[PDB]
Structure 1
Amino acid sequence: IIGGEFTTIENQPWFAAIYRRHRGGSVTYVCGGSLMSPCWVISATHCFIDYPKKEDYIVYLGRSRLNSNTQGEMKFEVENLILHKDYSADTLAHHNDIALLKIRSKEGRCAQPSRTIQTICLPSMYNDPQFGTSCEITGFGKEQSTDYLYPEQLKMTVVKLISHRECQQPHYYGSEVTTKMLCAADPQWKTDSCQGDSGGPLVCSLQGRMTLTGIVSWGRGCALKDKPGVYTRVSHFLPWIRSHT
């Protein structure tokens, strides 16, 4: 997250930290995700497609720092990695960028809700918030595009949603951005998600209810003028999410 503020997991308790174990034992951070029911975390297929072996991943719920074992966290392995069957990647745009991770502890259990581990609600069919709405994103991604290290403490920021007709303007993304995708950004281009934030949540408060409106997917640079962050529009995928869970 470029700009924004430092935060801890009690303020974003549906956030999942997803890591991959390499041959030889080291473990590195991969992408974010969101808890939608005790056994199911949803994220982006691009974080996994080049390493599609479910045994390789470690998922933490309740975790606030990249290298510290936060009180109350829970650690899980992946029982089923489900990637969308018509996923694909153009130069900038990524399509059907959505994945499900069914999680289980070493004892065979799903997550146990607590003050620092909670689910986030799914949207309804045909009802996403109007353009101009403020929504929050969260992750452990880069604080500047020239960094190579990620921040030790979790960050968040707030951005505004952008219409399909503005996002398809020539100096923004043209016809590369589609109606299955949602754009959001700072009007002053100073804060955004960035590499390392992919898969993480775009949460919007809609008619009273905090709602998983989007999944971090792609963008040209980070916090670059006229180049929004682009997010998978979760309401379109409700028939795929219900049939695969």
Structure 2
Amino acid sequence: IIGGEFTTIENQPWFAAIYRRSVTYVCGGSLISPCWVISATHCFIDYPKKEDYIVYLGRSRLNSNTQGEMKFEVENLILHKDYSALAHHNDIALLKIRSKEGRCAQPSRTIQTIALPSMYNDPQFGTSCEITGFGKEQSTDYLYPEQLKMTVVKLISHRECQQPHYYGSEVTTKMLCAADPQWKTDSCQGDSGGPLVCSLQGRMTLTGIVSWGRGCALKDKPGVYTRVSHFLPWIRSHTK
């Protein structure tokens, strides 16, 4: 997260921290149900083996064990069969979680689920949503921050993101662009798979999943997110 502010998991109780076995951070995710975390396929496409992954819920620091946190194994790693790639299509994935005790996540003050959107029902463009993650704080940074961060970006219409000086056609209707009017804040490397959360009809909703972007917080280069309200059938079937 470029700019923005630091926060603790309490403010984003659905945020999942995903790691791969050296134990290195991979990407974020979002808890949509006790046993299911949703994220981005590009984060695992190169190492599909579900055995190399560790998912944490209720964790606020990168390399420290936030008290009240829960460690899980990936029972099932479901990548979208139609994935293609920056410009990344169908960049969405599901991780079925279960602890060694063989159980799913238990809600608490630091562990909650996030509601899914209604099909093709997204906030009006210009709306302000939140993005959370352990991604770089600066494009030039070589390290990821130790403390969780979040910031605010505004939804951008596909017509405007479609423009050549922006992303041209690299962006599709299955994608949502979001950015700061001053391009002062944005998601960056390491935030992929993380949640783009918007308020809809008085309810925090998982409108997007950090997917890709040209650099970070660069003028005319929005952050691109997988448009969740366009993948509900896919999500429900694979989570039955």
Matches of 1:98 and 1:63 in 2, distance apart? 22
- 3-state DSSP of counterpart to 1:113: coil
User: 1:170 Cα shift?
Assistant: 1.3
Structure 2 CA distance for aligned equivalents of residues 88 and 40 of structure 1: 23
Aligned-partner SS, 1:215? strand
Give SS of 2:214's match.
coil
Q: Which runs of 5+ in 2 are unaligned?
A: none
- Any residues of structure 2 matched to 1:92-171 within 5 Å, and which? 92-171=86-165
- In structure 2, how many angstroms separate the alpha carbons of the residues matched to 1:185 and 1:83? 27
**Runs of at least 4 residues off by over 2 Å:** none
Task: Give the superposition deviation at 1:127.
Answer: 1.2
- Structure 2 CA distance, aligned partners of 1:209 and 1:80? 29
* Identity fraction in percent: 99
SS in 2 for 1:69: coil
Superposed displacement of residue 176, structure 1: 1.3
CA drift of 1:124 comes to 0.3
**1:2, 1:41 → 2: CA distance?**
24
- Give the superposition deviation at 1:125: 1.2
Q: Which residue of 2 aligns with 1:73?
A: 69
CA distance in 2 between counterparts of 1:48 and 1:126 reads 27
CA distances 1:26-56 after superposition (whole Å, capped 9, x unpaired): 2110000000000000000000000000000
**Size of the alignment, in residue pairs?**
239
Quote the offset at 1:178 in angstroms. Answer: 0.5
SS in 2 for 1:167: helix
Secondary structure of residue in 2 paired with 1:145: coil
SS of corresponding position for 1:221: strand
Question: In 2, distance between residues paired with 1:173 and 1:68?
Answer: 38
How far apart are 1:126 and its partner, in Å?
A: 2.1
TM, length-normalised to structure 1: 0.97
Counterpart-to-counterpart distance in 1, 2:178 and 2:120: 18
**Shift of residue 67, structure 1, vs aligned partner:** 1.3
| In 1, Cα distance between equivalents of 2:120 and 2:89 | 19
**SS of aligned partner of 1:213:** strand
Shift of 1:214: 0.3
Deviations 1:79-120 (A, max 9, x none): 00000011011xx30001000000000010000000100000
Partners of 2:5 and 2:99 in 1: CA distance: 31
Secondary structure in 2 aligned to 1:188?
coil
Instruction: Report the secondary structure of 2:109's partner residue.
Output: coil
Secondary structure at the residue paired with 1:100? Answer: strand
* SS at 1:239 equivalent: helix
CA-CA distance at 1:68 after TM superposition = 1.2
1:176 pairs with one of 159, 163, 170: 170
Distance 1:153 1:175 in 2: 35
User: What per-residue deviation string (whole Å, max 9, x for no partner) do you get for residues 145-194 of structure 1?
Assistant: 11111101100000100001000111001111101000000000110000
Question: Are 2:227 and 1:233 equivalent residues in the alignment?
Answer: yes
Whole-angstrom CA distance in 2 between matches of 1:194 and 1:4: 12
1:175-222: CA deviation from partner (whole Å, max 9, x where unpaired): 111010000000001100000000000000111000000000001100
- Alpha-carbon distance between aligned partners in 2 of 1:241 and 1:27, rounded to the nearest angstrom: 28
Structure 1 residue runs of 5 or longer lacking an equivalent are none
Separation in 1 of the partners of 2:32 and 2:4? Answer: 25
CA distance in 2, matches of 1:161, 1:172: 14
| Equivalent residue number for residue 84 of structure 2 | 88
Q: Distance in 2 between matches of 1:105 and 1:230?
A: 32
SS at match of 1:174: coil
Measured on the aligned residues, the alpha-carbon RMSD in Å equals 0.5
